[model samples]
Target: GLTEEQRMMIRELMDAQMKTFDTTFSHFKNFRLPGVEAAKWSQVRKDLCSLKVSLQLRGEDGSVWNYKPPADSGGKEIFSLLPHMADMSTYMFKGIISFAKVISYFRDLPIEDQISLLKGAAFELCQLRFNTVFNAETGTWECGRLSYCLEDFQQLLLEPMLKFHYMLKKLQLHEEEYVLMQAISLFSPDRPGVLQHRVVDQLQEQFAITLKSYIECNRPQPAHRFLFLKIMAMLTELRSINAQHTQRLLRIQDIHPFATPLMQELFGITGS
Candidate 1:
């Protein structure tokens, strides 16, 4: 209800503050990394991040909620298995600020790509191992010794989209937006457990109903893989942006719609 000049000033501040904030909350939340500022959303993101979920598929014409590991998994094979691997990785990365493994993740990344890594990538991906051996009836059986570990699959794949979503609404980012997000890339750096956590399990459950009955994995069809990737990327972009508007705790201080809780708290006291 003031003048245009006042609005512009507010807008500029809002952009910077929110820019700092979204990344701040997401950074600590995603990995539980300690920051100089213990600003806000720390506990919420931590608890939400720590929730233990597992990989299980439905049974008997996809009807019952059948929760069990793969047929060939048990014992130390359990540790070698994807679900176990993912659980360990999730716990390690959650409070990653000082862990040696976590530190090594960023330290070892390619210098140029370090930022791109943070902006987001499918650091947690499924790795399948296969070998050839002679068989009696069939000349060769090209079977997959597979362990599908990409958690939620959909959300991790859609990470670029999620970041894009964050960028467009408050930040309206292009490639540069990727620059800022890239700082955290190491948190999910394709390490054993890191890749799996990137999958947004919450969203994947919602989308799984649409998958086909014939979707058994010897090798995933190229068509299905491509379709899944498209879905993931788009979701990431859209979801991150929507996050911008919904948090009233994140409203602008002077016009920067993105002020951090600390900044707002301080501004509320010091400024007019």
Candidate 2:
């Protein structure tokens, strides 16, 4: 009980750190990381200096983050970082919910802090992955942490992304997914909601500034810009196709053969 509150705080902080890192690294092509702007960064650096002065950086009592304990994981399984693959749905349906919170938190932070938070967490995530993948005793894939391979994760998302894109093409609906997504039918896509608009405007205005600066300035990363354009085009295509599928789903008694996989992923809502 003594450590309860501090532990909880640490958990919350680390969770935030992890989410921010994921967001930062994944979108490095488009944005700077969090925590790069954190006032605490300098303070953390200073603290590390003090630690070095007062204690040893290695041996006996070393920083756990630096500790190489053989490994806690065996085999390069593509599961959770530092975890073995279990049930099909290891993470559950919380991606959107968790991501929303993380985005809001990042937005609230100063630009510098935002960058700081993300970069700090990326190394931490790697350390975590290292711990999860290495087995001290035998050294083979021990199934310690989820053998979360980045290449593999991208591969996993490819199918669903393609599936959704495919269903949309077949349906040929000419609308936004936000407009036709029946799963989220409670919100009207035709008319902009004031609440959503407020948030959207805030983000849009800021992002617009960033985009304008990047485009109009001498920051010439043409290859990166081209890749981003390609991704944007693909997403645009994705959304339209998604809208078409949503339109089809709304009309059918059951999910279409093409769309059933996605629909089953959305069970348990009363008919609208």
Candidate 3:
């Protein structure tokens, strides 16, 4: 029941927003490790990358190496921030905050509603952003010229994250599809206790319509067909990963003293 002018406005607004988004967070479209920029970083063993604990390593022939850092590895001391490694973390927080400005409706949301939506969707949005670096044809995850299996990380996140990447790679989404899915996740309407659910629902529908229009640009007639279904299906699969990781992060917060406050806020971790 959208008016013609309203549809045009929605189309233009989303077009402009996507353009701005492309310009702003474009660097993160290609993933990179936080600490070092190594042309052959993939050559580093996964045990060193995951780093469950300080490690001692010996080569097949005779060389020996230790993965231990100094006593103040986290830089808790003065002037410690210089060697910090969280470029991805900073980019994600900025993107999540910047996303609110994309449309007037989102910007005008009640503060509580904004927090609700952001906390619920930010991680999924991050996941969608990371998927940009995944190559479906080659079945590889590469960034900064370093390639590795999705399961290279340690602990609870490893397997589930790997599964999500492989499934998304198999889906073979185009770049435009990735952009639309990221937007869809950002406007999720089912976040618990939102101040106004209907408004968010309307925005979500606008994005769905926009995505359908974009998809039909190169396809046959009957624009709203299989592609729409598959896109929404992939989002549903994304929700499964979102649910798992939400609980995972919450639980990890208790045992992990080294957590980032930005992540705590993004995941809605409470002081209690």
Candidate 4:
């Protein structure tokens, strides 16, 4: 059990870290999902320092997806979309690590625990953050200004992707809720063999309680209790989807290299 002083320090750390964490979500909180401008997106990517890391974000053809260029008409580019996928995946990793640096206690955890947190939470984090790009009207993922059908991703992944987005559509969550969910995702304590697991659990509980309180105050609906429970259920579905995608990516990695080292490391694509 933490002493009074220790708990006081944790509260101070969490308060400061909470503000730092919100920095990443500030713009994204209001971002429109459909046909967001390329020039405007360039600025967000630049702020995140993501443009320099992915070549797919550079060229004219970069913004296009779910459509066949002349060279890919014959199915040679069946997996051509994977490069952009890798690029975005890598950016998510960088963004998470960058923000984690703002929280001293998160970094103070054992190195192995840090890796475990990133490895286990990466997909869940991506699922929540990238939901901004999902267009429910057409059921396509917007790759910047480009459009990619979620169906094009993988046969096994197709259903979960659809259902997750469908759940988001039904939930119609406020932007603040999305931000809160991402925090909860980051603090997940379920990973195998993480050091200081109880601390992680405490952090997760703190976020969960915060989310419940936020919903109680903001939603003001008789059914909010059920809505909040459904949101939690969606997290479980998101994890299952991510697990399936990981296996699929590993299978694809045998024939096609990941676009960057971060991608390989996150997916264990290297020594395979």
Question: Alpha-carbon error at 84 in model 1, in Å?
Answer: 28
Models 1 onward score TM values of: 0.20, 0.30, 0.64, 0.68
* Clash pairs detected, candidate 4: none
Residue lDDT tens for model 1, 110-207: 54333333323322110000011112122121222212222233343244423332223332222222222222222333323333343433223422
Query: Where does candidate 3 stray beyond 4 Å?
Result: 1-87, 136-140, 144-158, 221-225
Measured by lDDT, the strongest candidate is 4
Error of 3 at 35 (Å): 10
Candidate 1 off by > 4 Å: 1-103, 108-219, 242-247, 252-272
TM-score (C-alpha) between model 4 and the true structure:
0.68
- Please say which candidate is ahead in TM-score: 1 or 4: 4
Query: In angstroms, how far off is 227's CA in candidate 1?
Result: 4.1
- Name the candidate, 2 or 3, with the larger lDDT value: 3
Task: Give per-residue CA lDDT, model 4, range 111-221, as digits (tens).
Answer: 888788888877777677667666677655555543445333333233565667766766878766675676677677888658788998897777667667667667877
Arrange candidates by TM-score, highest first: which order?
4, 3, 2, 1
Clashes of each: 25, 32, 0, 0
Give me candidate 3's TM-score against the actual structure. Answer: 0.64
